[PDB]
Design a protein around this ligand. Sequence first.
Ligand SMILES: [K+]
Lengths: 308, 307
Amino acid sequence: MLKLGVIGTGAISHHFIEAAHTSGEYQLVAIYSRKLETAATFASRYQNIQLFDQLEVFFKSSFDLVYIASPNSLHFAQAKAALSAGKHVILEKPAVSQPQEWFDLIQTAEKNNCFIFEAARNYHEKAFTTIKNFLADKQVLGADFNYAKYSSVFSDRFAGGALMDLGIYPLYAAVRLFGKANDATYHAQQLDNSIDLNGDGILFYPDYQVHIKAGKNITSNLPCEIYTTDGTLTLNTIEHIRSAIFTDHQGNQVQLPIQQAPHTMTEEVAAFAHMIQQPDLNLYQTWLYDAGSVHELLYTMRQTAGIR
Amino acid sequence: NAMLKLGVIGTGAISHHFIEAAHTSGEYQLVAIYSRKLETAATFASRYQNIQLFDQLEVFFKSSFDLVYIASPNSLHFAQAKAALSAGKHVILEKPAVSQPQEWFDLIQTAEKNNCFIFEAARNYHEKAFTTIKNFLADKQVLGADFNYAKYSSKAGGALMDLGIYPLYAAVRLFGKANDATYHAQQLDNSIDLNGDGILFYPDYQVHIKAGKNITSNLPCEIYTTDGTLTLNTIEHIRSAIFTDHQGNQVQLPIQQAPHTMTEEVAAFAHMIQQPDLNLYQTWLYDAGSVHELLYTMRQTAGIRFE
Ligand SMILES: [K+]
């Protein structure tokens, strides 16, 4: 049973704890906040969880790993501190503000014999294994992925922008299925501070391209499509995927065996515990490399859109 | 309102569909077909009766019909349309009407000089659905849109010109002329696009355009507003349009697709000739211009070059 420490008192931290408990693989033991009262209010619904308002004391505790869901600007210092204290880390997305920070965390992680994971919940869905297996003997000609849902220091603003907050999902989906792209572009409708409300991008692969749409002031219900020489694979979404149906050029359909998990974090929560308990190091390096690929794309896309 | 005598250039299935629609409207009668080989004209015309067949292009244009539908390869469109207008014939050019925007403006000058109409046969542009959608959106603040037209076919052209023209016409019909546009395509070695993705840039929003000929998309077309999303099943031969707000509520729009894809344009062209609304005509000319300007810009950004 993994003893779990938590940083960040948002609703997302409750949902992670709920999934961690439900997996039967974690035990919550510690919560940190700079204002002790905020931690106490957050932790009240749980039983005898120890509270900390000093990062250095928190990390001297006996827990095995920390889930970090604080604002983006604090991730790198907190995670680096966690890894230097011998704790495994799960960083909520986006894990870092920029690519170089990811590689530095990896260095600290290796140096301290610890794991660092980015909590990209869609990437660990079983559905992607099924889809990738199905595509293995097809010739892919393109794809179109989106995630846009209406909702009512600058770096933390940016991290809340469409590309960083929602666009990261179709980016992770593309990297999971297609690997690292050669190049990318992105253009956005922006606030006057340059933060993106929504936007459209393209990932460029050797023989095809992938359209990406992200939005937080608009809702898209568009399916996500992957084009092949013999037809089109249609996914209802690229996050918490529920169905995958292939239609050929005659109109004949085949349904892939997709079973979504009860909750959106179920699969990632199970993957992280299994990695820590029974290490598969090659697969871990794949996770690291893919996160790096996503961050590289985000950094490029931000620049092409003039988000600064 | 007398019956329009119609001549046709182009002996493909599209010309058959156009003629069928023209006859069905009750406002046209086919009288003449031109082809480079007179046998070809004869074979094409076998189902129709009392059709004059022509092998001589300028003689065809000086014959006694009222308007010509031109569905030859688009590299021939400009010269054929100019001659037709110079002979005092009204012209319908199958899409894309021209390969470059100045050709369209040059044809407009010839048409005005000869007191004749020039139409581009953009079948979706004339759908009643677009009037209904535009009226609906007049009460809304648009925040963006996503339009596509990608259909696999085995085998001036390419996905943008042949299929992308549909979502461009839809965008122009609803939103008017964009400030700017871009397009990036997957291309053959000759630079012609198999498929691609573009953006139309408007002052306060952008419109994603997808076109493709080696791939099939069944994505609906969406228009985003501050209060929700309007979803169209397609932007051509539109069947359904429904608005959904952010609280799960819907507004239905009254869409009734015509029996055929060309029904509404054929009716529009006859009505314009018989009972001209010249302000409306100028709108049609202007919008066609906007579409051809955007196509030309998009070809530049994508590096798509013909011949
Ligand atoms: K979706």
